[PDB]
Design a protein around this ligand. Structure first.
Ligand code: HEM
Ligand code: HEM
Ligand code: HEM
Ligand code: HEM
Ligand SMILES: [C-]#N
Ligand SMILES: [C-]#N
Ligand SMILES: [C-]#N
Ligand SMILES: [C-]#N
Lengths: 141, 146, 146, 141
């Protein structure tokens, strides 16, 4: 799905995120809940306040799923098969929401890794998040 | 847009620190690199074949400054965005034929650039206010389309 | 919306022949089958697991009639769509939390259904007028979101 | 990209379109130009009036590319490789436009094949046109 060039930028950028993937995942979720309130309807069982242990624990799972995806850019549908069932079949997440979380993930990365967040890397990560998003909403296609 | 008095103050205090040239050139440059189809609208600008050519192109910087200057006018006029962007809405609609979807894209690229430039100071709370802002400008620009 | 006097007459002459129940049940039924995530909003309706269950479901038909009846009110009030859909915009925004993008989807499904029902009489010219119409309703409903 | 079930509905529906693919392609273009005027900017060298020999000749090529795609649902990126270069590289078509033409293609099919245009077939053709659209804008990803 991605170009060889894109894969190289993606694996490189994620190596700089390193062990902060969980933290960035939690921050991206917070920015999404505040900036796009409609998305909160999917988490009625969560305490969505800043510093919430739940969204921190959740951001860790999101961060870990993205690290998994980066180590499997050649077969995302397979590696993300179960997440696609969860999101499209069980939760029925509106596809528009995947674009909102992607924008908040890029925003978070820009805050934390300003020098690494170059125009070329930005474009590759956008294609990466677009690919993951397509895999997770694949049960609608 | 629906912004309290504490949000409006935070939104305005940040714009005091925004260099329209530096931020403007970057936002427009990243739109062209990240969403390549938008290049179609700026052929007259010359070479935009790769990210290096684009970011260093003088017409891209000059134009980006113009865009952000009008964005700043919207920020200082949040109570009448549709009046501030009336002529521009006609320009982009009647003459350029830009699909309104691209106004949302540039709006979000600007936010990412503000994030990059302001770091930790661009809090989740402040970004949320800026999302209402960019959305309100996007809507004011799409006005003349319907 | 920007509709001449000959377009408004064509748009209105067609609505004279629209059975709100038959067209309403079909449009809502097809939205739920074609864009499965929209089912999330109508759990109370019961079984919507397959296209057969959905199209024959009584609550789906009854609700579809309601939607098209309000659509008809917009058609007869093209000069003040935002006033006609003010309460509904608050309902879908504040209470239901429906992303405005789905209003455009249902708008386009309705057009496909009108095409299916009217055949050759649903000319490219008449469809163009109906696209401005569905777009204007979609915008009136998204109003309370910004 | 499509489910086996979807492929079956798609090949079946297209067999009913048969030799009218060119005509439906020309009609869909007309409905698009009138309903979504911004799309006309891509055809400055065309006479866009009803009955235009050019859009008829063009609708034939569009119809023929879709018939080709239906006979190759297992490998669209390959079969449509050159169209993807033309649309994304040379013309730089805005992705939003692919959704507009798809809607007008479905509208045209509904007018001409009302009994065949069932909810299940409609859903499959939507996924089909979404897939072709993704292949044609693939150079942005
Ligand atoms: C890059 C996009 C996304 C990724 C990688 C992702 C990843 C995940 C993961 C790893 C889980 C945990 C499942 C488990 O614990 O087994 C999850 C659950 C969930 N996701 Fe996503 N997700 C994404 C986008 C979204 C979006 C856009 C929404 C809605 C706005 C959403 C809503 C949910 C919900 C409600 C749950 C279940 C939470 C719970 O009950 O614990 N996800 N997702
Ligand atoms: C928030 C969105 C935008 C704002 C505030 C904005 C603002 C402006 C302004 C101030 C001008 C100059 C008008 C004048 O000098 O009279 C302009 C021109 C222009 N804009 Fe936009 N714009 C926006 C989005 C876009 C987008 C998304 C595109 C295309 C993808 C676009 C394409 C152009 C072009 C091609 C010109 C003419 C440039 C030239 O001088 O050759 N604009 N815009
Ligand atoms: C053109 C777009 C639409 C129109 C004209 C419309 C119209 C209506 C109307 C008239 C009602 C009843 C209000 C009342 O009885 O007070 C309603 C309720 C509702 N609408 Fe919409 N609607 C639109 C789009 C949508 C979409 C796209 C969705 C979801 C995907 C949606 C979800 C609902 C739900 C869940 C209800 C409440 C149903 C219940 O009684 O349980 N609507 N809408
Ligand atoms: C299902 C989607 C589409 C298909 C299958 C398709 C197919 C084609 C084909 C077969 C050609 C002819 C190329 C040749 O003669 O070698 C073509 C050309 C072209 N297409 Fe598309 N197209 C699609 C969507 C679009 C859209 C959405 C636009 C813009 C609104 C567009 C604009 C053009 C233009 C401007 C040309 C060149 C016309 C000429 O100069 O002869 N296409 N397309
Ligand atoms: C998912 N968050
Ligand atoms: C306009 N840029
Ligand atoms: C609303 N249906
Ligand atoms: C291409 N039409």
């Amino acid at each position: 799905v991605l170009s060889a060039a894109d894969k190289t930028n993606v694996k490189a950028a994620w190596s700089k995120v390193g062990g902060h993937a969980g933290e960035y995942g939690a921050e991206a979720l917070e920015r999404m809940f505040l900036g796009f309130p409609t998305t909160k309807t999917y988490f009625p069982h969560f305490d969505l306040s800043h510093g919430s242990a739940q969204v921190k624990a959740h951001g860790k799972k999101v961060g870990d799923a993205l690290t998994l995806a980066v180590g499997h850019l050649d077969d995302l549908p397979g590696a993300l098969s179960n997440l696609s069932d969860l999101h499209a079949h069980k939760l029925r997440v509106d596809p528009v929401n995947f674009k909102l979380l992607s924008h908040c993930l890029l925003s978070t990365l820009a805050v934390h890794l300003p020098n690494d967040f170059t125009p070329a890397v930005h474009a590759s990560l956008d294609k990466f998040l677009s690919s993951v998003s397509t895999v997770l909403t694949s049960k609608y296609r | 847009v629906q912004l309290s008095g504490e949000e409006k103050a935070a939104v305005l205090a940040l714009w005091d620190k925004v260099n329209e040239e530096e931020v403007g050139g970057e936002a427009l440059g990243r739109l062209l690199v990240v969403y390549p189809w938008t290049q179609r609208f700026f052929d007259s600008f010359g070479d935009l074949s790769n990210p290096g050519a684009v970011m260093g192109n003088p017409k891209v910087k000059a134009h980006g400054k113009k865009v952000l200057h009008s964005f700043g006018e919207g920020v200082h006029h949040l109570d009448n965005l549709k009046g501030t962007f009336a002529a521009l809405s006609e320009l982009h609609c009647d003459k350029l034929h830009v699909d309104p979807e691209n106004f949302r894209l540039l709006g979000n690229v600007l936010v990412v650039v503000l994030a990059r430039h302001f770091g930790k100071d661009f809090t989740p709370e402040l970004q949320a206010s800026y999302q209402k802002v960019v959305a309100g400008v996007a809507n004011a620009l799409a006005h003349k389309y319907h």
